[PDB]
């Protein structure tokens, strides 16, 4: 699909194709996009519908004047992409009360356990709250184990029972535990050996109605895709509050149909998480995905951080002395850094997004990030004062930083200006 | 006076080399002649809008134009250009002694 999200700007071409008509720009794209889908799993029965509705509109509308059609088209395209997928209902993944019951019903494994992590993981790096997890699966091996890891490796205990093949108890057991300790949120992955899905649920049956869980979720890898539909489906009935997510994004190639099918049941998602890494999990809201043409955008996010910074120096001392008396030192510069990789200086989103308003070049984003660490290299390879008078960088005083930071000269001189010029231009206020 | 098409295992009658075969060539009438026969070293300054410095300097379009003997199944030399009947006629395309194309 991704490479369709290009058809996007591939479309932002006044030139147009051969057809004098350029009239076809659309339909192609349609089909084009239309293609990229099913090819990427995606069911089709539906499609007709979309592709249709799409059409429908046309012969019943026009872009309010004062606005190039081409564009409009989209709003519409986009428009229906939404509906096409998780139409619109903003999933409510946060606290109804506290603490909580995360019944994690999983078909055969696959994200089975994993998932939980970032999930939990996620919420700890969110509310003073107290997670808590439990190995709610005894058929397949590495219950705790593989999982167990993270648990600590994230600063989040968990609990289970070696070997010990029997949910319920253990579950129950767990539960009240944290509870007794009065934690805030529990996550507990489960499943069963029944070769039939009704048997799966059949299991969750007791599982559920024995515990009395508030929030319940199933999950699946796009591996299965549109097929999945059913699976989940049968259950939306079991429990409508039944919301879910799709294991592995970067973990397939089919996707679509997966999430597609879902939707088309009134299905309820909340996240998705590209795959590996303790954080790849993400919230979810059609648009969000799709954001940026067919799915993920931010920065708006990464964007909004400016506000974080820009308006925080405000935050040394906002004044912390109304004025001007010279009260701080310009090494933010490097200050920027930290934040950022400390937390969120991950690529912030710096992608750039649509080259807009001016499309400039490939290395600009494209070529420093991955590697805007370097700049850092030094800095900490220098006294405070240094960065306050970034104009006392004699060949002498620095080569040491050069080596002291481990970087053969060049790199530096070859930067010193990306500092004294930044401003230069930067500082160009009338 | 172009003496190469898609490949000519030339030699080096003169030019710091004895007889190093090669390719590229691109000899012509208004253009150059480049082959591994020669190469050099010195990169050019790259101020950074983007590091327009891929780095690595060796030959680019090294010198040495015409006046270069082309391949022969045996030793060297063997100046080409003779001419044959029909067989295209878009060029003499033959060889000295016995041969035509490689």
């Amino acid at each position: 699909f991704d490479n369709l999200t290009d058809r996007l700007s591939r479309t932002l071409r006044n030139i147009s194709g051969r057809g004098r008509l350029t009239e076809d720009n659309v339909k192609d794209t349609l089909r084009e996009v239309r293609m990229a889908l099913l090819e990427a799993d995606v069911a089709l029965p539906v499609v007709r519908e979309f592709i249709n509705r799409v059409k429908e509109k046309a012969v019943g509308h026009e872009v309010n004047k004062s606005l190039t059609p081409g564009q409009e088209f989209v709003k519409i395209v986009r428009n229906e992409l939404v509906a096409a997928m998780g139409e619109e209902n903003q999933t409510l993944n946060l606290a109804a009360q506290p603490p909580a019951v995360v019944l994690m019903a999983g078909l055969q494994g696959a994200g089975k356990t994993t998932s939980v992590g970032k999930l939990g993981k996620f919420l700890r790096e969110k509310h003073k709250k107290k997670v808590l997890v439990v190995s709610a699966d005894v058929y397949r091996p590495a219950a705790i184990k593989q999982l167990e890891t993270l648990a600590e490796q994230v600063g989040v205990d968990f609990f289970p029972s070696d070997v010990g093949q029997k949910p319920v108890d253990i579950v129950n057991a767990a539960l009240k535990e944290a509870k007794l300790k009065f934690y805030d949120v529990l996550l507990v992955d489960t499943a069963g050996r029944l070769h039939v899905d009704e048997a799966m649920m059949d299991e969750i049956k007791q599982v559920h109605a024995s515990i009395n869980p508030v929030e319940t979720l199933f999950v699946v890898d796009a591996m299965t895709g549109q097929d999945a539909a059913n699976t989940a489906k049968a259950f939306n009935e079991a429990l409508p509050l039944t919301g879910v997510v799709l294991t592995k994004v970067d973990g397939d190639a089919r996707g679509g149909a997966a999430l597609s099918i879902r939707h088309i049941t009134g299905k309820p998602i909340k996240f998705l998480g590209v795959g590996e890494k303790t954080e790849a999990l993400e919230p979810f809201h059609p648009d969000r995905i799709a954001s940026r043409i067919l799915g993920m955008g931010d920065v708006l996010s990464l964007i909004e951080d400016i506000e974080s910074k820009v308006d925080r120096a405000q935050a040394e001392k906002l004044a912390s002395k109304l004025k001007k008396g010279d009260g701080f030192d310009l090494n933010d510069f490097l200050e920027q850094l930290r934040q950022m990789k400390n937390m969120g200086g991950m690529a912030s989103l710096m992608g750039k997004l649509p080259g807009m308003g001016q499309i400039p070049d490939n290395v600009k984003s494209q070529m420093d990030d991955k590697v805007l660490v370097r700049m850092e290299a030094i800095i900490n390879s220098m006294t405070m004062k240094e960065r306050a008078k970034p104009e006392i960088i004699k060949g002498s005083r620095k080569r040491r930083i050069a080596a002291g930071c481990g970087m053969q000269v060049q790199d530096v001189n070859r930067l010193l200006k990306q500092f004294d010029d930044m401003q230069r231009m930067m500082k160009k206020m009338k | 006076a172009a003496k190469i098409r898609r490949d000519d295992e030339v030699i080096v009658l003169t030019g710091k080399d004895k007889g190093k075969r090669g390719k590229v060539k691109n000899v012509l009438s208004s253009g150059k002649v480049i082959v591994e026969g020669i190469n050099l070293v010195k990169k050019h300054q790259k101020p950074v809008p983007a590091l327009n410095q891929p780095g690595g300097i060796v030959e680019k379009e090294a010198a040495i134009q015409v006046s270069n003997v082309a391949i022969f199944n045996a030793a060297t030399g063997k100046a080409d250009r003779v001419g044959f009947r029909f067989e295209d006629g878009k060029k003499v395309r033959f060889f000295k002694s016995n041969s035509e194309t490689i």
Binding site: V299, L302, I303, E304, D305, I306, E307, V310, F333, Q336, M350, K352, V363, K364, S365, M367, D368, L372, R374, M375, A377, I378, C405, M407, Q410, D411, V412, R414, L415, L416, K417, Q418, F419, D421, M422, M425, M426 | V48, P49, A50, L51
Partner: peptide, 18 residues
Amino acid sequence: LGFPINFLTLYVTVQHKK
């Protein structure tokens, strides 16, 4: 604000190689 501030911040880091 978010554009320049963020774009200058961006343009500066790339240009300054160290």
